[PDB]
Structure 1
Amino acid sequence: DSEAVVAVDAVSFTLLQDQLQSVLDTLSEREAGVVRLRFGLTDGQPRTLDEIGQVYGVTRERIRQIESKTMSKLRHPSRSQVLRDYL
């Protein structure tokens, strides 16, 4: 059964969800929220630059810069090593 749930990747996925939540919490609240609504983690829809700008009162260019900085600092060795095994 191809579509059947394997019952182990589900546990891996929920633990990955918890670990990603914790990792996002380690960062600043502003950057964590920017990433969350940019990649659609709270809800299904990944919001757009205009949407995050209009909900955070920040220029779209500044939001792009802070998103890039957040991504670069989230590529940091310890976080990357922690998340590596989940792949």
Structure 2
Amino acid sequence: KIRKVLKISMETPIGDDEDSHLGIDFIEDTTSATTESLRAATHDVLAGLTAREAKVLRMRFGIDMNTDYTLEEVGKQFDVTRERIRQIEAKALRKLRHPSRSEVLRSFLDD
């Protein structure tokens, strides 16, 4: 909390608009074309996975749709049962354990 000053006020590292440059005026296609590539690669893998499980594991934080909804418009495209609609966003940690499961996903730190 003293380095608050000393991290930048000596002669300033390249911090574009500190970190807020992620959400500023740059959100235009000058950045979001890479979002429309991470979204493509996650849309690929999360549509080859299990015929039930392949919905859930896209919800809450903005993953796949221009409004990445809670239950109502997603459950009506999942059918049969309930909040497996959310739990499978995390289930992947334990039998998608096989680290090869990201072989087509990781490039979007780099394009």
Asked if TM exceeds 0.5, the reply is yes
CA distance in 1, matches of 2:41, 2:86: 25
Comparing both chains, which one has the higher relative contact order based on Cα–Cα distances under 8 Å and sequence gaps of 6 or more? Answer: 2
Displacement of 1:57: 2.5
Unaligned runs of 5+ in 1: none
Deviation at 1:74, TM superposition (A): 4.1
CA RMSD of aligned residues (A): 3.4
Q: Distance in 1 between matches of 2:82 and 2:29?
A: 45
Distance 1:12 1:47 in 2: 25
- The question of 1:77 aligning with 2:77 is answered no
Q: Measured at CA, do residues 6 and 43 of structure 1 come closer, stay the same or move farther in structure 2, by a change above 3 Å?
A: closer
Structure 1 partner of 2:44: 22
| Structure 2 unaligned residues grouped into runs of 5+ | 1-20
% same residue: 32
Q: CA deviation at 1:16?
A: 1.3
Higher helix share: 1
Of structures 1 and 2, the larger Rg is shown by 2
1:47 to 60, 70, 75: 70
Between the two proteins, the alignment pairs up a number of residues equal to 79
Offset from partner CA, 1:7-37 (integer Å, 9 cap, x none): 2x3322212111111011120121112223x
Runs of 4+ in 1 over 6 A off after TM superposition: none
Q: Does the aligned pair in 2 maintain the 1:31–1:66 contact within 8 Å?
A: no
TM-score normalised over the length of structure 2: 0.48
TM-score normalised by length of structure 1: 0.57
